[PDB]
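Schema walkthrough. Field components (list of strings):
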Amino acid sequence: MIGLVGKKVGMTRIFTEDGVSIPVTVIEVEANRVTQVKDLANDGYRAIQVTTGAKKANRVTKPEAGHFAKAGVEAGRGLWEFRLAEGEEFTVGQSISVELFADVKKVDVTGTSKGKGFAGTVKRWNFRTQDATHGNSLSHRVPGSIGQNQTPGKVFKGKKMAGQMGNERVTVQSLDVVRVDAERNLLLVKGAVPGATGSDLIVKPAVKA
Amino acid sequence: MIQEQTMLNVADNSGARRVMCIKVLGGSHRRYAGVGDIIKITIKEAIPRGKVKKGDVLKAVVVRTKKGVRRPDGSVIRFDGNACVLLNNNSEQPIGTRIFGPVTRELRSEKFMKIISLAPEV
Amino acid sequence: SRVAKAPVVVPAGVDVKINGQVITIKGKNGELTRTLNDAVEVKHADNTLTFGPRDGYADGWAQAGTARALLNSMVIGVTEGFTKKLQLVGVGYRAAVKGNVINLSLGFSHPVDHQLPAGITAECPTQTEIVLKGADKQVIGQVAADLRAYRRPEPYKGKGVRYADEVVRTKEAKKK
Amino acid sequence: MKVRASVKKLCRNCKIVKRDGVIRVICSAEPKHKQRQG
RNA sequence: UGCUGAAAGCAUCUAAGCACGAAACUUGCCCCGAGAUGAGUUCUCCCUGACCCUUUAAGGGUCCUGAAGGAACGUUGAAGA
RNA sequence: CGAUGUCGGCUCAUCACAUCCUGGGGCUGAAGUAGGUCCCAAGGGUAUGGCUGUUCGCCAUUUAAAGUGGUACGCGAGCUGGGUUUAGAACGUCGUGAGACAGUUCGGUCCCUAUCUGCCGUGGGCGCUGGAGAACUGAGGGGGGCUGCUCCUAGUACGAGA
RNA sequence: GUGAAGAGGGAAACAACCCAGACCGCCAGCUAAGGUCCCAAAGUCAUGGUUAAGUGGGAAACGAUGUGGGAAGGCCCAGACAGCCAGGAUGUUGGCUUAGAAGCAGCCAUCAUUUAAAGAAAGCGUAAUAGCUCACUGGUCGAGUCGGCCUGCGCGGAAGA
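Field assembly_structure (string):
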């Protein structure tokens, strides 16, 4: 089934009547407007493309402005589309609310993780550091050996080395949905989700049922 | 957070006063023992008249930790020292007759009934 | 070869249709359709069935021999059918059946359900004996084998599911 | 199941069979005479 | 491990045919991915004025127009050498 | 021999299967739990300490297991320098002696700013053909794949009992 | 003999293996070893056989109703081989080493009746017994069947970074 696009809004905890406190991530899921519906006849697959939020009138380009005007949908920030499960249908211009998550229990949240920049092997791949004393010289956090000898004669592809860490989309799956608030457009999910505050997130029902 | 080579006090009156943890049981490559995990210890100094002598290896259960324990609502319990209770290596069965100091309720595993009963508090 | 050189008499009231190499036989139970090997030719041979190996196949005689056995099996099945009897040995063993599903309890923590295929009927005259009937011999043998595989007989008490007409070897602990 | 390289008719009730290019010995009296590689 | 089954009247898991059968294999889960030069698909937006020249060609030169959009610059960022 | 640094340790690994564990099976002198042996299986996993420079090994306590090998007995332009293997000194022994001893002790400089291949990241150029802004399909590639204990079934099947 | 001190063609690459000894030029022809489906020049050429294994295109002792051919031999419509309802008994619980070996541990003979037909005993199984089979013998269908030798080509044996 289709997901929804929301914005991460900090974190909080919910106190239950029995005493236990549930850490919850707050996701602001306002109305999602369908801008385009894809069908097997034309696109070879069925999907719905949705938009959310708002954009400055002078900031949206003409190609994007015409695309929204065709669907009669107010311009929003970015576009995302979700594949259909063959059991439901949608129409252009339809608005989708967070209420569809009322009957679900597990969700999958996808977002861009925080960017750590160029990271070393110790931080990136949990490499073990070498001794800080006992004669060690300029080799306290160095990766160490990266190959065997002449017989391979090369470093194998996929070697773990320092490089860019974070700033890629990652998915946290099977997260418990704690509360849904349609009128206030909130979705409380137990746990933590990728990305920093204000980052766009995609929420869909858990697939590992 | 009890790991190998850690000093522990003895809550019971078995005659031991200070013990060394030499192994954390319950899993391969386990790092440190929790609130109520079984550990293997060696006695470093005990009462001469006690039933347990120095330099003997026997199991033990942690009852108090300096690091503390976490409650489901976010509360924590912390102590000024680490304490344990002695065992029999074949059946858990704390050999002590009385245990001093508070004991947390995390040990209620349908089994440590003897420990909790002897506990002056909780 | 030798078996192939032995036509099988078709009893009255049985319809045989030869569509190329496919054979359809109708008796009193149902229509049985079987595709035949390309290396064997069959003609109506009124009142009988005959099989001949076409030239150009080294194993032509063998394919004829197995073909003749298959045709006889279907002829018997449509005329009368095939029945197999299975016995359950062991305390607390039930073999209740209802509709098209067999319920068994072979000492497992959960019930065992078996979905019979089309054209197979199961009856339970007694709580431990189950009898299966059908129009062809291959399917009944397969179904009975599937039923037996659930709890193979073991050679200390002969428990589990066994065929009505088989002998199960038994052995005893020698010392311990 | 014996996986020896030499197969023989150990008893009278032993039959030589070829299955999937592998020569097997099947016995209907005692399983101890069943052997795979031939 | 089998069902049926001849060669070999029997038997036989196999030769024809039909069943099951493992953390292995393919998929299912997550991520990258059309430089996939085999460079894909869909949606939307913008440009529809004149002169001449020759070895008259998917040719060259001049005037007027240069849109969508992009870049640059600035303020910057939970993005970043 | 106009120079290929040769034992251990650390970091980082990768492959084979003659499999240590987990998975699927045959036979058993397999009652059950637990075993013995053989076949299929390399997806993942596959200890911490004391003594010694040690690999190994003995010992202590864990785990489902603490697998066997290849890779310059993997890896010093990645680290250490304990052993061995310069110059000092001493002991035992051999020699008249200088000295010698896979005999033993004390002490004893480990250089390199990366051109190319490779690998981990991240950009520019052009192409994909009128140009431009977006959203995708997905060929193909990679990551992940471990498992203990307790309870129910049941104290059931099995067993004279345990 | 070749290389060293010899190029050229062939064996994928490969001084020393096979063919063959380069004076120079030619967009001429015929051959050697080796080859002729495509990479890649030339037979998807002709005739008669073999192989089912990717054998060909690594490897042995040894194992096996794989398959082709040859020379024979025993039994066979006074009817064979495999199947099918049948029979397989009486002392020989033996004297013998009497502990029980009784055919199924051996000293031992290896007798004898009913007989269409049976042995003082071949297998499994009992402390020995018992018991179940096969040797052998009747009846139906009924035609070939059985065990060795010579070998052609194949299969297993056959696991490494």
